[PDB]
C-alpha cells in the first residue's frame, strides 16, 4: 500500500529488465544463424591430406560435440534459485548451436567460399586452397608442389592448439570475467536487503509488529527507499553492460561473417599474417 | 458472535419431571476451560446457581440440591442437558444456560442465554435491598460476607435490565470488561469485611439489578440478595 | 566472523606447585599437557571472599559439582584421599546443578571461558598429542558443551590442582575481539582459519 | 487492458505475476520435562509452626500452574502483586514457597499492608509483594481427638518483624523492668503458645494449611517459565513454520544432510535458511518456498482468432489449480504437442515455440533449416551457367528527437517557496 | 529530482546507442554508395556491385 503510491518505477525497472534479457537472444541469432542450410559432411574423408576430425562433430557423444568445443565447455566453470528473483533459459539450446557450427564448418570446407553468396558448389581442397594462395599474391605451383609438407604443417598446428588449450592457460577469462561480475552483482543485489538504512531493525515484520500501525511509515519508508535505491542502482548496471555485450557480439556476428565466409584482405582483423581461412 | 439457545417444555405437575437443552453456537466444548452452567432465577427473589458442566468429565452440583440435579453433555451436535426431579410448585422460575472459561475463583460467567420460563400446575452473602440516588453525584452498592474474610476469594458484579439476561460489570475486583461506561468502578473495604461497587456519576441510564457472587471450593458458586437502583 | 579469539602465534603463559590468582581480561584459554591428572577444577570470582558470589566447579572421580554459591576460599586452595581443604563455609547456594564430566601420548585438553550476556560458555575438547612441554602443531576447533546462567560478574579466576602426601603444566591465555575468516569442509568441521590482521598476506586473502 | 490497445498483434506478452499462500501455519517446540516439585510442597505430610516457617527455592524448570488451578480443595486463591490469568505464560527468575499452619481466623491478615499478631510477629508481608495466597482447611490432619499441643506461634515480642524475617530463638521476655533472666516469675512469660486445635471446635478455630509463593526478578537471565504448546509436521505444502522462536515461510520436506550435534539451522548460501532442525524428532527438514513466477499469454493475433494459450514460468506445474504440455521453461495449457517440427513462429523458450495450425495452437521443436549434403569429389566442380541480379533494402536510424526540460517549471511550477 | 534523473540517465544511455547506428549507417555510405565493397555481406547478400 504504500509501494503503489511512489509512482511507476517498478513498471520502467522490469521493462528495462525485458529489453536486457530480449536482446540476448537476438545476439545469439544474428552471430550463429548466418546459414540458411545444414550441410553435412560426406562420409568420405579425402581432402588431400588435411586432418579434420579434431575439429568435426563426434557421434560418440550423445550432443555430437566436438572434441575442442567439448575441452571448452569443460574448461568454462560456473545463478542459484531463492526467492526474489528468477532467472530465464536461452531460446537456442547448446545443441542447436553446435549443429549450426557443424553446419558451416562442412559448408566452408566442402564448397570454399561459394556457399556464403548463394548455393554451395562443390571443389576438391586442395584447389580451394590454391585458390586461397593466388589470393594471398602467390602462384598455385607452390602449393602443388609442397601438398604434404603444408598439410603435415597444418595437422601440427592443430595439435599444437589441442596442447596450449589443454594447458590449462587463462585464454578463457573472457567469458569466466562476465560470469563472475554478473554473479557478484546479484550476490551484492541479494545482500542489500539485510541493510538498516536508518531504521531500527532490517527485519520487516519485527517492525510492523513492535511498533504501533499508525507511527510505523515513518520506519517502512525509509527502508523503502533504500531498497528501491538499490535496485535502480543494479538496473543502471546491468544496462551499462548490456551495451557493452551487444558491441562485443557485433563484432564477433561481423568477424564471422568476413574471417570464416570469405578471405579478408585487410591487415590484423583474421589474425597475424597473411589469412588463409 | 457466540449465542446459547435453551429451550424446554412449559407446564410442568408435581408427579412429573422434566427436562431442559441448552444448545450453544458459535464455539466448542472441547475447547480448554471452556463451561456450560444453569442458573435459574425466580421473578422477584434472588437468582442462585444449579449445576455445571466442564470442558472434561467433572459435574459440580448446588450442595442443597445435589440429590435432585444431574447434567449430562453431548459434544455430538453441541448441547447440554440438565435433568430435575422431585417438582415442588416453589420451583417456577426463569432458567438460564451460561458459560464459563477457567479455573472458577477468577472467570466470571461472560455470556448467558435466553430466559426460558417454567410454571408449575396442578456462607452467604448480604446485599442491601434498594438504593435510590439522584442523578448527577456519585452513589455507591455494599456487599458484604458473612463467614471468612471478603479479601479470601474476588468478587464480581453484575446488572440485569429488565426483560434481559445480566451482563458483567466488573471482575477481578479491579478489571473493567471491554464496552462498559468508565463510571463503574470497585474497590474492597478489608476492615469491614464487604466489597463496594461505585458509579462515578449519574450521567446516563442505568435501570438494572446489581448482585455480587464469589467462589470457594466448599460453597461453589453463590449469589447476593440483589439491590435496585433508580433514578429520582 | 568477529569475535573474541585468541591471536594467531601470541604468548601464552606457562606455569608449573603454584596456583596464582589471574585476571579474567573477558576471555580465558586453558590448555592443560598430557599424563596430567592433579588439574580438578577452576575458581572463578571477583574477589573470592564472603561480600561477592563466586562460581566454584570441581572434578572429582565420578561427576562434576557446578556451584555458583557464596563461598569463603583459603589461601592455598588444594584438594586415602585427602580432599576438599579449598573452603569453610558456603551457604546462600543459588545454582547447584551437577552435570556429566567432561572426561573420565595421553591427551591434551584445551579450555575457553567467556562471560557473555549474563551466560557462562564452555568450549572444550581432547586430543591426544605428544610433547608435552610445547604447545603442539595442528589445528583443532572446540565445540560447546554447556551454558550457565549465573548472570555474576567475572573478574578473577584461579585453578584447583590436587594434592596427594606433583608438578603440572598448563597453558593460559587471553582473548580479545578481532576478525577471523573460518573454512568450513563438505560437512560442518571447521578445517582452517586465518586472521585478517596477521600479515599483509592474510589481508588479501 | 495491459497493451492499452482493443486489437493485440501476434506473440507473447508477459500480464501479471503468481503466489502459492499458505494454510495451515504450524509451530513445533521441545518435549516439556523437568516439571517444578509442586508435589512436595502442597501434598507434603510435616507442616512447620507459625514462627518457624519453611522456605524452599525453586527454579529452572517449567511451573505448570493448571494443577493449582484445577484444584477442588483450596479455600482462598488470591495474587496480590501480578495478573493471575497470565501466570500460565509468564516467565521469572526464581520462586519461593512458605508453608505453615494458622488457626482458621488467622488466614485474613495474610496479605500486605494488614495488622495483627502473625503480621507482626510472625509472619510480615511486604507492600510490593508479587505473588499468591492458597491456603485449605486441613483440619482431619491436624486434629486429633484427644487435642493436638504441637503448633507454636509467638505472641510476647519487643518489635516489629521486618518482611521475610525469621526469629527461631526462644529467650523469656523481659515485660518488666527488673531482668528476669530466665526465671518464670510475674512479668516474664514464655513468648511462644500452643493452639488447640479439636475436631468439635467451630470453623474460625480449625488449622488450616497456607502455602505463600513469591515471583522476583533480577537481571539474571529468567530460568522458570510456563509451559509452551506445540501442533503436529506437515510436509510437501506451503506453510508457516516456528521453529524454537525461528519463522518464515516455505516446504518442509526431507533431507539427506548430516548436522552436528550442537548445530540447528543452516545458513550456507547468502544468510539464508534453508534446513532446520525438528526439535521433537531430531530431524533434519528442508526449507524451499513453495512457489511464485510470471503468467504469459501467447496469442495469434486478434484479426486472426481470439484463441489464446497461458504460460507459466518455472513452474513444476503441479500447483496451477485442455491440453497439459510440461516444458523446461514451465508447462503451458491450450496447446497442443506434435511430433512435427517447423521454423519457430512464437518464441517460448528452451527451443520451444507455437504457432496456429489455420484452427488451434500448436507447440514444436524448432527446426534449423533444410538439411543437405554436398556430392563432394576430389575431381569434381560446380560452375554456374547463368546470372540473377537481386535488389535488397537496408534500413539504418540516425537521430532522434531534440527535447530540453526545465526544473523549475516541472519540479516546482512557479512557485516562490519550492524554489 | 529523481524521476527526472532516471529520466536523464535513460535518455543518456539511448543517445549511445543511436550515435552507434549513426556511425555504423555513415561508414556504410561512404563504403558501399561511394565506391564497390569487397568485404563480404557487408552491403548485401552476394557479389556487391553498387
Ligand atoms: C538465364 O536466365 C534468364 C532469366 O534471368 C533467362 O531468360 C529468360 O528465358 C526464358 C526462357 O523461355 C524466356 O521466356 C524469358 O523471356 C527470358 N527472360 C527473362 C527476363 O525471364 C535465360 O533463358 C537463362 N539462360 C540463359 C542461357 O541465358
Ligand atoms: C587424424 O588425427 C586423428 C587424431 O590425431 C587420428 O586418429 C587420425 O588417424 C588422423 N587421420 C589421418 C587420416 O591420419
Ligand atoms: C562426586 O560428586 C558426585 C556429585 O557431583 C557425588 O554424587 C559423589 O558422591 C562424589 N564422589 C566422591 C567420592 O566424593
Ligand atoms: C547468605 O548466606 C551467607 C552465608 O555466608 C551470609 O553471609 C549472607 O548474609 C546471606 N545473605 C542473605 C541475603 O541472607
Ligand atoms: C556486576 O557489575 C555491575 C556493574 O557493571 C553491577 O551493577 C552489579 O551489581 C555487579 N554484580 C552483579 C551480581 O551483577
Ligand atoms: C563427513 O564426515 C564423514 C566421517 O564421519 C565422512 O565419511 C564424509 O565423507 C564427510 N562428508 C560428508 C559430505 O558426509
Ligand atoms: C497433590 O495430590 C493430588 C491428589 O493426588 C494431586 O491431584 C495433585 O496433582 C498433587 N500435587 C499438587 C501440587 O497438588
Ligand atoms: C519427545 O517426546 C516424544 C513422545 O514421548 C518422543 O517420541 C521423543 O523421542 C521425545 N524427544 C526427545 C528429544 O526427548
Ligand atoms: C488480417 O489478416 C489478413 C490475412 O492474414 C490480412 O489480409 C488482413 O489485412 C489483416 N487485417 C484485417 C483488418 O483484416
Ligand atoms: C514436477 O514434480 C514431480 C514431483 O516431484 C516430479 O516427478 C517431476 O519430475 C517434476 N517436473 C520436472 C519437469 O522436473
Ligand atoms: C512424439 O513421438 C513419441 C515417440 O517417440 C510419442 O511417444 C509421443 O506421444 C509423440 N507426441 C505426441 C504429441 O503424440
Ligand atoms: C579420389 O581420387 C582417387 C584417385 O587418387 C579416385 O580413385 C577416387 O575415386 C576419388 N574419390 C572420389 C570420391 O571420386
Redesign the pocket.
Known sequence: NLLLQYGSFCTQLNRALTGIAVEQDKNTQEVFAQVKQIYKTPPIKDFGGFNFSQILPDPSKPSKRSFIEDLLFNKVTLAQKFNGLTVLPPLLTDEMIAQYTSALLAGTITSGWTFGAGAALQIPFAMQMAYRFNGIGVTQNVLYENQKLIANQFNSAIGKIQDSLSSTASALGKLQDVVNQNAQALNTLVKQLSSNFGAISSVLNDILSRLDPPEAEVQIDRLITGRLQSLQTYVTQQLIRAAEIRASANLAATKMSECVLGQSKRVDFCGKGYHLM | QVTLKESGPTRVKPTQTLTLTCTFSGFSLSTTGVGVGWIRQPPGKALEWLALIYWNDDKRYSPSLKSRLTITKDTSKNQVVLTMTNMDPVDTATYYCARISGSGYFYPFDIWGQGTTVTVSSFMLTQPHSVSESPGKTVTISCTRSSGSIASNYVQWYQQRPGSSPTTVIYEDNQRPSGVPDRFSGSIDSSSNSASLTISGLKAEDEADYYCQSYDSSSLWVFGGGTKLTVL | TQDLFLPFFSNVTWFHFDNPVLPFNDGVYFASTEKSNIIRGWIFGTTLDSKTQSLLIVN??????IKVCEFQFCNDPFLM?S?FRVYSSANNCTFEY?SQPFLMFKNLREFVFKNIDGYFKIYSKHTPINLVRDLPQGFSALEPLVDLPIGINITRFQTLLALHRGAAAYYVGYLQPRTFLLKYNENGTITDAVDCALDPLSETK | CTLKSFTVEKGIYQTSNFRVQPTESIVRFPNITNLCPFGEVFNATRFASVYAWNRKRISNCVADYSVLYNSASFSTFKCYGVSPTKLNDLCFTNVYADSFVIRGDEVRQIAPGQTGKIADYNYKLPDDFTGCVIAWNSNNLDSKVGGNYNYLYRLFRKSNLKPFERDISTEIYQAGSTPCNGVEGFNCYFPLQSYGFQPTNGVGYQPYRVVVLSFELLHAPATVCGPKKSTNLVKNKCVNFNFNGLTGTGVLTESNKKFLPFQQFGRDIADTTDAVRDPQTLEILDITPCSFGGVSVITPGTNTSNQVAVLYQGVNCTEVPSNVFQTRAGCLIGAEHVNNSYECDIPIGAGICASYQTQSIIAYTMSLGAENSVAYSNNSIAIPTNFTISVTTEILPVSMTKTSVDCTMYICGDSTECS
Open positions: 572429582n572421580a565420578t561427576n562434576v559439582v584421599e580432599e551437577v
